[PDB]
Write a protein that binds this DNA or RNA. Structure first.
Ligand SMILES: [Mg+2]
Ligand SMILES: [Mg+2]
Ligand SMILES: [Mg+2]
Ligand SMILES: [Mg+2]
Ligand SMILES: [Mg+2]
Ligand SMILES: [Mg+2]
Ligand SMILES: [Mg+2]
Ligand SMILES: [Mg+2]
Ligand SMILES: [Mg+2]
Ligand SMILES: [Mg+2]
Ligand SMILES: [Mg+2]
Ligand SMILES: [Mg+2]
Ligand SMILES: [Mg+2]
Ligand SMILES: [Mg+2]
Ligand SMILES: [Mg+2]
Ligand SMILES: [Mg+2]
Ligand SMILES: [Mg+2]
Ligand SMILES: [Mg+2]
Ligand SMILES: [Mg+2]
Ligand SMILES: [Mg+2]
Ligand SMILES: [Mg+2]
Ligand SMILES: [Mg+2]
Ligand SMILES: [Mg+2]
Ligand SMILES: [Mg+2]
Ligand SMILES: [Mg+2]
Ligand SMILES: [Mg+2]
Ligand SMILES: [Mg+2]
Ligand SMILES: [Mg+2]
Ligand SMILES: [Mg+2]
Ligand SMILES: [Mg+2]
Ligand SMILES: [Mg+2]
Ligand SMILES: [Mg+2]
Ligand SMILES: [Mg+2]
Ligand SMILES: [Mg+2]
Ligand SMILES: [Mg+2]
Ligand SMILES: [Mg+2]
Ligand SMILES: [Mg+2]
Ligand SMILES: [Mg+2]
Ligand SMILES: [Mg+2]
Ligand SMILES: [Mg+2]
Ligand SMILES: [Mg+2]
Lengths: 70, 87, 116, 101
RNA sequence: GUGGGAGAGGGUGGUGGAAUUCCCGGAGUAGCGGUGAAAUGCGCAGAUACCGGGAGGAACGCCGAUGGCGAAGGCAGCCACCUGGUCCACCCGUGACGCUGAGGCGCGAAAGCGUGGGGAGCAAACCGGAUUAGAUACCCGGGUAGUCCACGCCCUAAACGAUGCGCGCUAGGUCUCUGGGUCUCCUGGGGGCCGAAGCUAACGCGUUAAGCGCGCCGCCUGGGGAGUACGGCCGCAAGGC
């Protein structure tokens, strides 16, 4: 099972405007992924958190989606 | 807040010799600066209790350095209290 | 006699009942059914079998309008949350995509004592 | 003064007279608050994540600045009065924490 | 002092999505609801389920932890501003300026009181439906205060680590949050588990001591009567010490 940062470049964890990267951290549903998947560190994760929620408010990143298959 | 610029300007005007950062004088001044800022902050915002506690803490520290001073050099203290507007 | 081609099927399943409503590609319904629509009355309304019967029923009624392709939307939980989609597939409605939409709050409302 | 990124998001369907006009009044807003402009990024059209003002997309600008801190709030309220401005975010800049660094 | 940091610490304004309720609208019948089974209840004045729009209040899913912050009560969307505490490194300044702390003064979950707003959902009292030998109860349906905001009182609690504060001393191993380093590791500062010596009535505690010491405050002296009586103080009251 791939972690996220396992496959990714040298990338800004700050920047709330870059979607192409930030999306790679959410499930099918708009949910932020746990460490267990994002392979982040403590403070790493925790910054990611905020930078996403800024993205969300800006409407570049979704608050939720719906489950397919099922 | 207090930027470096303003803070430094204080230490320069409070120092006994060039480069002293640590005299009773310097500490009492600096303290008092932060004190008065805190007063203006709680003259609005009276509903902020935690900062207020911080201010009692500080106020006390000032009083202790003062009481030391007055114990040691009564003159430095008379003067310093004077140029500071206290009592 | 709307003559409705393809469309969507909502399954609202609960612990006391299951209900199925069928609709057009913009969301206006066509027919519907529930467990008490068919004869059942009490607790019996929340069997899986109920969920079946209703799904089917709603389907028969939909094929009445000429329904074929169905895109499914599921909300809630209960037995025959699943038996509904199972006898929805067996119906003869060829099912395009299942989706679970079951809505949840981001936390605003206090719940009933029943609930916490 | 301190460094703030600004973002403005407005209705896609504006023509040129309109779009350039909202830009002008935005400028006049920054000026009128003492906002100095360090640089600008204009993406414009982007397909949103969820609809905003019944709109599947939005129009995006980003303005980095330096400006007084008693202002930055009221600054943002005037920026937002505009009917055709859907979102206003203002954030003080931060240096780029890097991961997979 | 200088430089570096982490944080649901506080106060103030803005602002975002999900959800509940309600109003409007389309489409569409005969039920929905709820239970152990039921019934009240809502529904042909068109409910429920589905779609579109609006209004309002409250609370912040995932991230989230066996996590962080705070003296404590406590503190979670996002943003800006005002502000508190605190950790590290550098070894620069002052030169014992220290610890504790009876009174005092300030803070102090919830419920509660006053005045004025607000009221989605929940909901003491209450109104009903059931269950039962009866039901004032558990379960169901409604529902007022309240819950929310401003201001002013109230001062309690399993206000719990049931463990007063500060300092020095006394094997380790392990997990972790946050600094610094020549970054298998090491070195500060928090958080947890196991465990040396030791302590303990046992349970347990064990560099986050309940061990070895010192300073200072608080407190105890069989159970009931009783946190009662009386007196005093405080309180609008409830009532508190
Ligand atoms: Mg039922
Ligand atoms: Mg009830
Ligand atoms: Mg607007
Ligand atoms: Mg500093
Ligand atoms: Mg905070
Ligand atoms: Mg804050
Ligand atoms: Mg708010
Ligand atoms: Mg209607
Ligand atoms: Mg009936
Ligand atoms: Mg009727
Ligand atoms: Mg009737
Ligand atoms: Mg709606
Ligand atoms: Mg209203
Ligand atoms: Mg959780
Ligand atoms: Mg702490
Ligand atoms: Mg607690
Ligand atoms: Mg600070
Ligand atoms: Mg030295
Ligand atoms: Mg000397
Ligand atoms: Mg209180
Ligand atoms: Mg209260
Ligand atoms: Mg009241
Ligand atoms: Mg209710
Ligand atoms: Mg009754
Ligand atoms: Mg009875
Ligand atoms: Mg007391
Ligand atoms: Mg003792
Ligand atoms: Mg340890
Ligand atoms: Mg390191
Ligand atoms: Mg440790
Ligand atoms: Mg142990
Ligand atoms: Mg032993
Ligand atoms: Mg120790
Ligand atoms: Mg000790
Ligand atoms: Mg003991
Ligand atoms: Mg006795
Ligand atoms: Mg009592
Ligand atoms: Mg007496
Ligand atoms: Mg009395
Ligand atoms: Mg009296
Ligand atoms: Mg009492």
């Amino acid at each position: 099972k791939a972690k996220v940062k396992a496959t990714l470049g040298e990338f800004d964890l700050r920047d709330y405007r870059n979607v192409e990267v930030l999306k790679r951290f959410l499930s099918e549903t708009g949910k932020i992924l746990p460490r267990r998947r994002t392979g982040l560190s403590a403070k790493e994760q925790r910054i990611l958190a905020k930078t996403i929620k800024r993205a969300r408010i800006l409407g570049l990143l979704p608050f939720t989606e719906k489950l397919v298959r099922k | 807040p207090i930027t470096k610029e303003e803070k430094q300007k204080v230490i320069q005007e409070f120092a006994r010799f060039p480069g002293d950062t640590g005299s009773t004088e310097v500490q009492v001044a600096l303290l008092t600066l932060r004190i008065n800022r805190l007063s203006e902050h709680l003259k609005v915002h009276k509903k902020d209790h935690h900062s207020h506690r911080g201010l009692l803490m500080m106020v006390g520290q000032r009083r202790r350095l003062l009481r030391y001073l007055q114990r040691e050099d009564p003159e430095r203290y008379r003067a310093l209290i004077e140029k500071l507007g206290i009592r | 006699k709307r003559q409705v081609a393809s469309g969507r099927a909502y399954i609202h399943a609960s612990y006391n009942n299951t209900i199925v409503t069928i609709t057009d590609p913009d969301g206006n319904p066509i027919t519907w059914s529930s467990g008490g629509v068919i004869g059942y009355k009490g607790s019996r309304k929340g069997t899986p079998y109920a969920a079946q019967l209703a799904a089917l029923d709603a389907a028969k009624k939909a094929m009445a309008y000429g329904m074929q392709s169905v895109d499914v939307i599921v909300r809630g939980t209960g037995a025959g949350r699943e038996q509904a989609i199972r006898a929805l597939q067996a119906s003869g409605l060829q099912v395009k995509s299942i989706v679970d939409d079951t809505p949840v709050p981001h936390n605003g409302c206090r719940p009933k004592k029943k609930f916490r | 003064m301190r460094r703030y990124e600004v973002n403005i998001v407005l209705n896609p369907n504006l023509d040129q007279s309109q779009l350039a006009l909202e830009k002008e009044i935005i400028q006049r807003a920054l000026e009128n608050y003492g906002a100095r402009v360090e640089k600008v990024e204009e993406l414009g059209l982007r397909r949103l994540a969820y609809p905003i003002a019944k709109d599947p997309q939005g129009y995006f600008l980003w303005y980095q600045v330096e400006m007084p801190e008693d202002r930055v709030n009221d600054l943002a309220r005037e920026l937002r009065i505009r009917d055709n401005v859907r979102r206003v975010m203002v954030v003080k800049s931060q240096e780029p924490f890097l991961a997979n660094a």
